């Protein structure tokens, strides 16, 4: 990955990446995008210097996106779920969809829908957690029931077996870097196995996935640009537009729209989908519209907290008004309400940012910048 | 409608067995997995017969501080007429709690008021000094009885004057004197008591108490 090349070089204190004399240079555009990507992941600071998080990611042998997710994953014993999600994403999708099954027989589609509703319990608006469900459900399926489980649930056995092996290997890498006894850690099947995550654990997981994919977050068109795209309760979910955070503003906004994939759990939801959605990537497949590979839905403040480490989030001046006193402790320390802006700056009309809900925050003045410390 | 009429939830949850094997590192050193991650004592204090009834009426106010602040297990055996205190290994935390509790019961046993006895639990530098009249001087018969009256004074005024001046508490049990207070304080009280035993009139002792009482405030 180009970001891996940049991440490694920055850990070597090599400053000039663009003009570096590579034997086989990557494209300058890719290097610039790669540098920008690392900043969003908090690996490189505003001056393009490696940070403490950045040094750790350089140690990992995985791509920086997955490396970032694992680093912030050692909280509230949610690591076993993240390892399952990262492993499942790396190997691939194990779900055989109705289109592949050619059933888009009436009894078989009912079983297919039942099998999908079987794995849909973790969260209504998230597809990545469904991917977590099958992987975790696998560990409790004994050897003699594997083929029945795959056949019953329309899953790919060989892809599933690869996932389980990757979980053990992936967990070893994380514990080795994080744990004090770096070399000595040994993985066990019992560590991989875990019970259903609690509701608070589910919310933390969505934040954890957001850390990997901050830049890959989309908002509905109705929120940012009401009436630019006609919306009604009658409109199906797959027809609801979304806009990525960093999409360039075309003369016509309809081009920048993205739409939910039919296979996603969001399709059968019926009700209005989440305003903010986190996607793995975009696919031009489908002549009508571009599709978004959804992972989970993030709320406003959770997005602000994750984007806080990166440079994709900008903060306003202290809000003042009814019950909005800016408590000030020292000349360089204050507490105030601020309306966060995520994405492009208001001055920057090329890229398409937006404003998040106001939140109380603690700010400390560093180098003339009221840098944020934590949300109150 | 009233007759007087005209005409997203942001979530608050924010992200903030040993292995029996060895691994050799690149220098060749071994590397092993991490290993898996107040004693029971008792004291016995025997209560004399004349302190049974005061202990009976004052028990409601005796076990709470011992059981709550000191985390001790309190019982008294009616058969032996003694108070038992035990350190509970699972709750007790202060190693000196048991000995501190025993002293508090001992002070009440000697004859001190309960509220004064609590000072032993509250503070850590209060002691009890004890001595007899015969140690100072061999007084017998009426001479001994007059000496006790001289220490107490009329209406106990002389005893209270010493207690107020020296910041102590005195129990005058027949020819046996017990003084409760700080180390420097009980020595000051002891001197005044001993002067009274040797024969000094109370009025002269009262004057010296006023002198030392003045000094005590400036320091």
């Amino acid at each position: 990955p180009v970001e891996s090349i940049v991440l490694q070089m920055k850990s070597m204190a090599i400053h000039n990446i663009i003009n570096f004399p590579f034997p086989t240079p990557p494209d300058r555009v890719a290097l610039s995008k790669a540098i920008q990507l690392l900043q969003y992941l908090g690996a490189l600071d505003n001056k393009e210097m490696i940070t403490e998080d950045g040094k750790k990611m350089s140690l990992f042998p995985l791509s920086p996106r997955f490396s970032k997710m694992l680093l912030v994953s050692d909280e509230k014993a949610c690591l076993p779920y993240i390892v399952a999600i990262v492993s499942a994403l790396s190997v691939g999708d194990p779900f055989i969809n109705e289109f592949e099954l050619g059933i888009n027989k009436k009894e078989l589609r009912s079983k297919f829908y039942k099998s999908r509703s079987q794995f849909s319990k973790l969260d209504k608006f998230s597809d990545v957690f469904r991917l977590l469900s099958v992987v975790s459900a696998m560990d409790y399926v004994p050897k003699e029931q594997k083929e029945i489980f795959m056949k019953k649930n329309f899953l790919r056995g060989k892809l599933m077996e690869e996932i389980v092996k990757l979980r053990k290997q992936l967990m070893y890498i994380i514990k080795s870097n994080t744990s004090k006894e770096n070399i000595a850690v040994v993985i066990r099947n019992e560590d991989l196995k875990s019970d259903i995550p609690s509701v608070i654990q589910i919310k933390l997981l969505k934040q954890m996935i957001c850390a990997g994919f901050v830049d890959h977050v989309a908002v509905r068109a109705d929120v940012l640009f009401p009436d630019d795209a006609k919306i009604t309760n009658r409109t199906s979910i797959i027809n609801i537009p979304y806009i990525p955070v960093l999409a360039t503003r075309t003369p016509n906004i309809e081009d920048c729209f993205v739409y939910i994939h039919p296979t996603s759990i969001l399709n059968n939801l019926g009700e209005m989908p989440p305003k903010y959605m986190l996607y793995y990537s975009l696919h031009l497949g489908g002549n009508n519209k571009t599709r978004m590979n959804t992972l989970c839905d993030i709320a406003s403040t959770p997005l602000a907290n994750i984007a806080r480490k990166g440079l994709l989030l900008t903060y306003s001046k202290p809000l003042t008004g009814q019950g909005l006193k800016t408590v000030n402790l020292s000349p360089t320390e204050r507490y105030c309400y601020v309306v966060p802006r995520f994405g492009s700056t208001v001055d920057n009309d090329l890229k398409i940012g937006w404003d998040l809900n106001p939140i109380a925050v603690h700010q400390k003045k560093q180098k003339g910048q009221w840098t944020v410390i934590k949300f109150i | 409608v009233a007759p007087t009429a005209l005409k997203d939830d942001d979530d608050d949850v924010l992200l903030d067995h040993e292995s029996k094997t060895v691994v050799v590192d690149d220098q060749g050193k071994p590397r092993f997995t991490s290993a898996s991650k107040i004693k029971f004592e008792s004291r016995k204090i025997m209560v004399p017969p004349h302190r049974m009834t005061p202990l009976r009426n004052s028990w409601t106010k005796i076990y709470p501080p011992l059981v709550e602040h000191l985390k001790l297990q309190v019982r008294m055996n009616l058969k032996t007429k003694s108070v038992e205190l035990r350190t509970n290994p699972k709750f007790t935390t202060d190693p000196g709690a048991l000995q501190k509790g025993a002293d508090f019961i001992k002070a009440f046993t000697l004859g001190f008021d309960l509220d004064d006895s609590i000072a032993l639990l509250r503070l850590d530098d209060l002691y009890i000094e004890t001595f007899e009249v015969k140690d100072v001087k061999t007084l017998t018969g009426d001479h001994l009885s007059r000496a006790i009256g001289r220490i107490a004074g009329k209406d106990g005024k002389t005893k209270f004057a010493i207690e107020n001046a020296t910041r102590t508490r005195i129990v005058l049990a027949d020819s046996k004197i017990h003084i409760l207070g700080g180390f420097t304080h009980i020595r000051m009280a002891r001197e005044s008591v001993v002067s009274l035993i040797l024969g000094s009139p109370p009025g002269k002792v009262y004057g010296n108490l006023r002198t030392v009482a003045s000094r005590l405030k400036e320091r």
């Binding site: 975790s136 259903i196 | 019982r75 008294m76 035990r86």
Partner: peptide
Amino acid sequence: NPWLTLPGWGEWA
């Protein structure tokens, strides 16, 4: 699977 009276008078107190 899941994914599918005087206290302490004569007795210790």
